[PDB]
Paper text:
We determined the X-ray structure of Tet(X6) at 2.2 Å resolution with Rfree/Rwork of 0.22/0.19. This FAD complexed, anhydrotetracycline-free enzyme structure consists of a conserved architecture for type 1 TDases: a characteristic Rossman fold containing an FAD-binding domain, a substrate binding domain, and a C-terminal bridge helix that connects the two domains. The 393 amino acid long polypeptide chain alternates four times between the substrate-binding domain and FAD-binding domain. The FAD cofactor is bound in an “IN” orientation in Tet(X6). Thus far, the FAD conformation in structures of type 1 TDases have only been captured in this “IN” orientation, while structures of type 2 TDases have been solved for both “IN” and “OUT” orientations. The conserved FAD-interacting residues include Pro26, Val27, Gly28, Glu46, Arg47, Thr59, Arg117, Leu139, and Val324. The conserved substrate-binding residues are Gln192, Arg213, Phe224, His234 and Gly236. Met375 of the C-terminal bridge helix also interacts with the bound tetracycline substrate and is conserved among the type 1 TDases.
TDases are class A flavin-dependent monooxygenases that covalently modify and inactivate the core tetracycline moiety. Here, we investigate Tet(X6), a type 1 TDase first discovered in a Proteus genomospecies, by determining anhydrotetracycline-free and anhydrotetracycline-complexed X-ray crystal structures. Tet(X6) inactivates all classes of tetracyclines demonstrated by in vitro enzyme assays and phenotypic studies in E. coli. Here, we present structural, biochemical, and phenotypic evidence that anhydrotetracycline binds in a substrate-like orientation and competitively inhibits the type 1 TDase Tet(X6) to rescue tetracycline antibiotic activity as a sacrificial substrate.
Numbering used by the authors: 23 to 393
């Protein structure tokens, strides 16, 4: 009854926003999702996601999508490999644990979520630019100069959201590490040396402060990421131009001088690199207790943190579960109280996850680290 005759708008059709949409809409709420991506066919760059039983999988179950997730997810082994290609540990998958946290492609996840929504729930090509309250409703203005209205706004548009003002003025901060990601499509053909070294398992390696993570089978592509402490020179002078492949390759081949040729080949064979400083949206300061209209935040928009904890999507999916529950479970007598309780709970597990992620980051990039 809280949401009677209420138009709810979710900003962002990432995993968290689509899951929030589903959890509300299945209860007959009036939901719209605004997504900047041009259309549903847009390729989502990055690695695979794994849903944990007590958070992400619980959200999928509550949404009716757990078996669909299992159908499309792949259980993956993991090898810890030294810089010379020697496997130090092979942690293959046990049929016992195949459903513990199988890896799902990000586009596959978006599709099962989209398929669970009514048609035309997501409005594509809508990059929200301004969000200001008018009367008792929010005014949403998009890059394409269109405008829309809503009674409640849930911000789920990622860690770099520019529309957080009415919730908090806290700013994103860099943590001191940097990540470079890329894909090699059809790796069996195009990087056979490294693909064979992976041996059908995810690969992790750490050397001289440089971490390499790779997944040889993300829907026909090998995805890899190289992470390190941000060079201090970058702080003032830019040394690597991430629009110039050859600039990136020259830097990485320098860093990877001591590594086996199969790793150097992987770098030489990548057509395009994506470089990003690790960031956090810290939960140190409380959010604003006075807001002009109902608004809150979920996912990375709420608690962006370094991904080396394996945290990330599962916290966001718990946000959607708790916020959706609060809004539909009859326990609260206003939207504001339902939101405030959600934020209370999220700050709790969010602060915990952020603290673990910073510890792990400090440990993983120390020169003594060994997995
Ligand atoms: C290098 C790296 C590796 C990671 N690895 C993992 C991992 O292994 N496991 C894990 O669980 N997590 C991982 N994470 C984190 C995980 O990807 C995020 O937690 C997760 O994607 C957050 O989902 P979200 O829906 O909050 O935001 P996002 O996935 O960022 O989705 C936000 C959506 O909003 C859209 N959007 C943005 N701005 C606007 C706008 N103005 N208007 C409209 N729409 C907009 C975006 O296009 C996008 O669709 C990793 C993160 C990084 C950076």
């Amino acid at each position: 009854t809280l949401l009677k005759h209420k138009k709810i708008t979710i900003i962002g059709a990432g995993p968290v926003g689509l899951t929030m949409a589903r959890l509300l809409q299945q209860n007959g709420v009036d939901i719209t999702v605004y997504e900047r991506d041009k259309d549903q066919d847009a390729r989502i760059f990055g690695g695979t996601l794994d849903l944990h039983r007590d958070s992400g999988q619980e959200a999928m179950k509550r949404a009716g999508l757990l078996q669909t997730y299992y159908d499309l997810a792949l259980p993956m082994g993991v090898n810890i490999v030294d810089e010379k290609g020697n496997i130090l540990t092979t942690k293959n998958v046990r049929p016992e644990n195949r459903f513990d946290n199988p890896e799902i492609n990000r586009n596959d996840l978006r599709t099962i979520l989209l398929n669970s929504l009514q048609n035309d729930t997501v409005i594509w090509d809508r990059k929200l630019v301004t969000l200001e309250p008018d009367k008792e409703k929010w005014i949403l203005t998009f890059e394409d100069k269109s405008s829309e209205t809503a009674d409640l706004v849930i911000i789920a548009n990622g860690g770099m959201s520019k529309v957080r003002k009415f919730v908090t003025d806290t700013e994103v901060e860099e943590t001191g590490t940097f990540n470079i990601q890329a894909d090699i499509h059809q790796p069996e053909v195009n990087c056979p040396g490294f693909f064979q070294l992976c041996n059908g398992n995810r690969l992790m390696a750490a050397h001289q402060g440089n971490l390499l993570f790779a997944n040889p089978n993300n829907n026909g592509a090998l995805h890899f990421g190289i992470s390190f402490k941000t060079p201090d020179e970058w702080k003032s002078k830019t040394r690597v131009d991430f629009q110039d492949r050859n600039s990136v390759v020259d830097f990485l081949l320098k860093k990877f001088s001591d590594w086996d040729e199969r790793y150097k080949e992987l770098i030489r064979l990548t057509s395009s690199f994506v470089g990003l400083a690790t960031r956090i949206f810290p939960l140190d300061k409380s959010w604003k207790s006075k807001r002009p209209l109902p608004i809150t935040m979920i996912g990375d928009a709420a608690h962006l943190m370094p991904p080396f904890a394996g945290q990330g999507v599962n916290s966001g999916l718990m946000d959607a579960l708790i916020l959706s529950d609060n809004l539909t479970n009859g326990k609260f007598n206003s939207i504001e109280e339902a939101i405030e309780n959600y934020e209370q709970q999220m700050f709790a597990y969010g602060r915990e996850a952020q603290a673990e992620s910073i510890i792990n980051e400090t440990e993983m990039f120390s020169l003594d680290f060994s997995f």
